[PDB]
Short mmCIF file of C-alpha atoms in Angstrom, two decimals:
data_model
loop_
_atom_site.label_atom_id
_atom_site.label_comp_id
_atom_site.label_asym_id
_atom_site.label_seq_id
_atom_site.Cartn_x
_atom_site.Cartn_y
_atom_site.Cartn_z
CA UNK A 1 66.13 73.35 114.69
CA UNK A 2 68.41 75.95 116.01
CA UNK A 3 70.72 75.11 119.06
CA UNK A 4 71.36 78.21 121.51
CA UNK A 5 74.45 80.34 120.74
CA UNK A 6 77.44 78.48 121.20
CA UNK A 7 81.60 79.86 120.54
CA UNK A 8 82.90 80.08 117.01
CA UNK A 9 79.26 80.45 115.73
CA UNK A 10 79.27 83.51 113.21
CA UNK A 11 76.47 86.61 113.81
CA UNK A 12 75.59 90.12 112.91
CA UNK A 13 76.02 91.99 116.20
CA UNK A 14 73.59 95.22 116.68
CA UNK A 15 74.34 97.67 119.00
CA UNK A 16 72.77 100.82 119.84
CA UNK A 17 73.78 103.45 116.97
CA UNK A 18 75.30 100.97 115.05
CA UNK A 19 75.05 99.03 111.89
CA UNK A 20 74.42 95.51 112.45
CA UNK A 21 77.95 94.21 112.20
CA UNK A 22 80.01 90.80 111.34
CA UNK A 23 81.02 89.24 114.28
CA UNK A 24 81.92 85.69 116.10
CA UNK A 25 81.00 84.47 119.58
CA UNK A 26 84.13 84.16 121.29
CA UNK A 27 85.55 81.67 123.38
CA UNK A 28 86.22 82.85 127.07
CA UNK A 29 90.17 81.69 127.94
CA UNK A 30 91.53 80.30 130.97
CA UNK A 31 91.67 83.01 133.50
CA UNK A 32 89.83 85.89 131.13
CA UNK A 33 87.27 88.30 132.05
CA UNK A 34 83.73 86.32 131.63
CA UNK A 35 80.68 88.04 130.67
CA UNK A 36 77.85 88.88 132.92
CA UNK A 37 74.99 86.18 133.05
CA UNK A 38 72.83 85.69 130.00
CA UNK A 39 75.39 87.50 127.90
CA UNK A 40 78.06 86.18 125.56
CA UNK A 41 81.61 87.55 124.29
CA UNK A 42 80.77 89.48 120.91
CA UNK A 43 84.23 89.73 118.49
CA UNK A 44 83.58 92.12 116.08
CA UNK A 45 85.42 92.08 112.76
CA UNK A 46 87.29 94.59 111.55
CA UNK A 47 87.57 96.58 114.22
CA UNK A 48 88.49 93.93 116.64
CA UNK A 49 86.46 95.19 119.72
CA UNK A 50 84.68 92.86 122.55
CA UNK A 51 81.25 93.68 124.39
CA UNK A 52 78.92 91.15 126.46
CA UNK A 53 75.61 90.88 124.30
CA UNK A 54 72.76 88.94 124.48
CA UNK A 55 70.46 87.09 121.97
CA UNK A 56 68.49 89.95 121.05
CA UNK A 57 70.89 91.61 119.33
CA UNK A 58 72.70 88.04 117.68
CA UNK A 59 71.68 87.49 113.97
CA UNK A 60 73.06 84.36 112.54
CA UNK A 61 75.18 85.26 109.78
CA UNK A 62 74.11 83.19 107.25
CA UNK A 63 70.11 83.66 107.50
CA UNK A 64 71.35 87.37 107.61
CA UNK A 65 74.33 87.88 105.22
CA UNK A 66 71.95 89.32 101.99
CA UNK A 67 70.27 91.87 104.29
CA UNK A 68 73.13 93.23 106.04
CA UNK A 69 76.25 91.84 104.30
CA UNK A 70 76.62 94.88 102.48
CA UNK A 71 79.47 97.65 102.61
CA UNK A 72 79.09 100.57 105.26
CA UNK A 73 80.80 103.92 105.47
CA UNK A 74 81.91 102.85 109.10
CA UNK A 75 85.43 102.49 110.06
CA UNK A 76 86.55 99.14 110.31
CA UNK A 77 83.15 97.47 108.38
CA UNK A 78 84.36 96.89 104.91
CA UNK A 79 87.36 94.94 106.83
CA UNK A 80 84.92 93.17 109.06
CA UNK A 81 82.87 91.76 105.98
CA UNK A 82 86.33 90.49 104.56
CA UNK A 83 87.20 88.73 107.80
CA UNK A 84 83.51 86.67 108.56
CA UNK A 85 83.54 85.46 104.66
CA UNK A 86 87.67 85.03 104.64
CA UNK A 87 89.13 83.49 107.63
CA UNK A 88 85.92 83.89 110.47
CA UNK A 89 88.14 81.26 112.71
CA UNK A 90 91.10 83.19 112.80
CA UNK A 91 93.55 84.54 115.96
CA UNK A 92 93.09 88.59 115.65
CA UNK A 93 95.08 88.97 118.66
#
């Protein structure tokens, strides 16, 4: 059975007007900006952007890599898909 979303753990990320996209949960460091309640960190690949996001919109990658592993016009996607299959663990700092 599934655990609840924990760091490291590898997603599709939707958000409003956009594909759903390859991202991690991130870890929060020492003395970082923590999300609000009930929300997580969100990396997203290839365009190396944070939001706060909750479950709703967290599709684990690997039930949902044939449906939306897939390459999109959208700047920074084709780069994300590299990155989740490639090196997913990876600083991108």
């Amino acid at each position: 059975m599934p655990h609840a979303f924990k760091p490291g753990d590898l997603v599709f990320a939707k958000m409003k007007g956009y594909p759903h996209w390859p991202a991690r949960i991130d870890d929060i460091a020492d003395g970082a900006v923590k999300p609000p309640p009930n929300k997580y960190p969100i990396f997203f690949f290839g365009t190396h952007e944070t939001a706060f996001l909750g479950p709703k919109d967290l599709f684990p990658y690997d039930k949902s890599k044939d449906k939306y592993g897939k390459p999109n016009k959208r700047k920074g996607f084709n780069e994300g898909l590299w990155e989740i299959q490639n090196n997913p663990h990876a600083s991108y700092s």
